[PDB]
Design a protein around this ligand. Sequence first.
Ligand code: NAG
Lengths: 201, 50
Amino acid sequence: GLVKPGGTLTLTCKASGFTLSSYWMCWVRQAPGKGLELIACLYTNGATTWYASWVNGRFAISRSTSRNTVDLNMTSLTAADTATYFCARGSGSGWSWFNIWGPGTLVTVSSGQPKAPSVFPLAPCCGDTPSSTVTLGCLVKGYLPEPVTVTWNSGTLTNGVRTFPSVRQSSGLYSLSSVVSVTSTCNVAHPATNTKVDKTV
Amino acid sequence: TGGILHYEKLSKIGLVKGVTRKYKIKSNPLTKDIVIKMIPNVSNMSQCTG
Ligand SMILES: *[C@@H]1O[C@H](CO)[C@@H](O)[C@H](O)[C@H]1NC(C)=O
């Protein structure tokens, strides 16, 4: 997900439910909070390619044809290129609608380098009166790569889980918050910085 | 049409007079244009075109 303005990145399809060579394959991109945009398809023969009008040779598709993978190459990246890049299979060998969408890979262009997340235990103090309904949770801030995973005590109780979407501060880093409710217990991992800390049950 | 082939002597040597036909040759063509598409439209089955 980390990349420098003007750098290069290579992605891969994560569908893995079929033989990749026998299907129509596009790469779909979606800027955060924006509409879906189609980048580039790849015919089953493997030489003929379709490209949108705006790429103009900036992106390129190929397949490993041995490991059953499909790649996308990027150059001269800018802030507009920050998006989630979806590998979409398209129902048939030829041009068609997509019925299988890959999980997607987050991509972030930024002058900053990966920052380890700051985890805070937010909780109503012990001094206030405890009601029958209690609400607890964790808080994560101070991290630069967008993707976060918020699990809770290894996820054995997810009935009251309520994770919130991330938001940027003015300096470019993100912060989220998660709350729970149980009768009168938190692990957050950030893979890009490889931090998986969990304390203060 | 008339006779200028001396058909009697010809008949004696095995050439019997047959049918007499007119002579018609093409002329004055009428020109019309038409488009022929050598590639079919496969939009309704594009998924299986490959
Ligand atoms: C992507 O392009 C760059 C520069 O042209 C090149 O160094 C890199 O090997 C390419 N990656 C792939 C997977 O083709």
